[PDB]
Amino acid sequence: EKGLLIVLSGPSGVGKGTVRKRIFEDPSTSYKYSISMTTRQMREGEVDGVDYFFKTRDAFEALIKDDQFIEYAEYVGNYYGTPVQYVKDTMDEGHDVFLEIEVEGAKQVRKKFPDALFIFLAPPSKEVEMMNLYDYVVVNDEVELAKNRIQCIVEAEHLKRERVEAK
Amino acid sequence: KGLLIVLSGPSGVGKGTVRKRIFEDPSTSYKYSISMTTRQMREGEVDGVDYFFKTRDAFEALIKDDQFIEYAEYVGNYYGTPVQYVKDTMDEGHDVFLEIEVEGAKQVRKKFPDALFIFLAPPSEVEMMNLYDYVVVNDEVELAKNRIQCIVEAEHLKRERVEAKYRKMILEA
Ligand SMILES: Nc1nc2c(ncn2[C@@H]2O[C@H](COP(=O)(O)O)[C@@H](O)[C@H]2O)c(=O)[nH]1
Numbered sequence: 635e636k637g638l639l640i641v642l643s644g645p646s647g648v649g650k651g652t653v654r655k656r657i658f659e660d661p662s663t664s665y666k667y668s669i670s671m672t673t674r675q676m677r678e679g680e681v682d683g684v685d686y687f688f689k690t691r692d693a694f695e696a697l698i699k700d701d702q703f704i705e706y707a708e709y710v711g712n713y714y715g716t717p718v719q720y721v722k723d724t725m726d727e728g729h730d731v732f733l734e735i736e737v738e739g740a741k742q743v744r745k746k747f748p749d750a751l752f753i754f755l756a757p758p759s760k761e762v763e764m765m766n767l768y769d770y771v772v773v774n775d776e777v778e779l780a781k782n783r784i785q786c787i788v789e790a791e792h793l794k795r796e797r798v799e800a801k
Numbered sequence: 802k803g804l805l806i807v808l809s810g811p812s813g814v815g816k817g818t819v820r821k822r823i824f825e826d827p828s829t830s831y832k833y834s835i836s837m838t839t840r841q842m843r844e845g846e847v848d849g850v851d852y853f854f855k856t857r858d859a860f861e862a863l864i865k866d867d868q869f870i871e872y873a874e875y876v877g878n879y880y881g882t883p884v885q886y887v888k889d890t891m892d893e894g895h896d897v898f899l900e901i902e903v904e905g906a907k908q909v910r911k912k913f914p915d916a917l918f919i920f921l922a923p924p925s926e927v928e929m930m931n932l933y934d935y936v937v938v939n940d941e942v943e944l945a946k947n948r949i950q951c952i953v954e955a956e957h958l959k960r961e962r963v964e965a966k967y968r969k970m971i972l973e974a
């Protein structure tokens with residue numbers, strides 16, 4: 635059966651990168667990561683096809699026109715986006731794909747992947763009002779706790795009657 | 802309000818054993834709905850712990866008075882979920898847990914369409930799974946318990962529930 639698409643976001647600085655890293659460190663599960671494309675200049679120590687696929691702005695816009703992104707956004711004059719083909723093929727192989735996107739991107743993703751798992755990482759306890767775009771809300775109080783919560787969510791998704799029924 | 806959690810599934814699948822294990826875990830926060838039954842009490846069972854044991858007369862008078870969320874006949878005996886405990890306990894904010902056979906679960910679904918329905922499946926039925934939200938295989942008791950636990954945790958993390966909390970809190974201030 636198809637792998638899940640798992641989409642993690644949250645406000646900038648909430649710690650989504652740190653939580654994602656811990657999740658991918660967990661040997662109980664096996665996730666695949668999408669390498670994003672960007673049009674920003676490559677920095678010291680970075681490798682094309684590892685940190686990012688680095689593209690010209692014209693190439694990125696050609697790819698947008700040909701509908702080759704699940705989602706994209708422009709930040710300070712540079713585009714960033716998730717290529718569609720890798721994610722599609724990888725899910726078709728039966729692997730769960732675990733994406734990190736910026737908050738407003740959920741709407742774009744959900745149009746193409748309505749049954750994806752959308753997880754909003756929230757800071758500990760108003761602009762956080764963008765959670766309405768998401769399926770689940772997980773508080774990043776501590777990295778280990780946030781990871782465990784996300785792992786219950788993904789585990790539960792695998793137990794969903796729809797999946798098991800079709801199976 | 803707390804969640805209504807419904808564990809059901811085919812006869813002999815091990816609903817009782819898994820429920821038992823769930824409530825032996827000190828980290829389990831749910832409150833168990835003690836059912837009424839008209840079957841005879843068995844060695845080791847305690848009235849008001851395992852079940853509220855009732856006569857058929859009393860059970861039927863309670864049916865007539867609409868005092869059950871659900872009830873069913875199973876191998877010649879009545880079993881049912883008293884309404885007041887579930888309503889009061891959910892109102893207090895506690896999750897309430899039902900362990901019931903499949904006909905009773907259908908009645909619960911009609912009255913509580915947003916309840917959490919978990920179907921306990923044998924390690925080996927497809928038609929039976931239709932109304933349910935989740936399917937958990939009873940391959941082993943500890944494994945089944947843990948799966949149910951992460952399903953309930955995930956339901957507490959649903960955005961609709963979390964958002965409603967945050968909104969009430971912002972409006973309150
Ligand atoms: N519908 C319904 N089934 C119940 C209730 N309580 C127990 N059962 C089910 O009745 C069956 C017989 O239980 P036992 O007689 O073995 O304790 C089990 O499958 C159990 O899940 C109840 O309150 N309602």
Ligand SMILES: [K+]
Nearest residue numbers: 836899900901
């Ligand atoms: K019961």
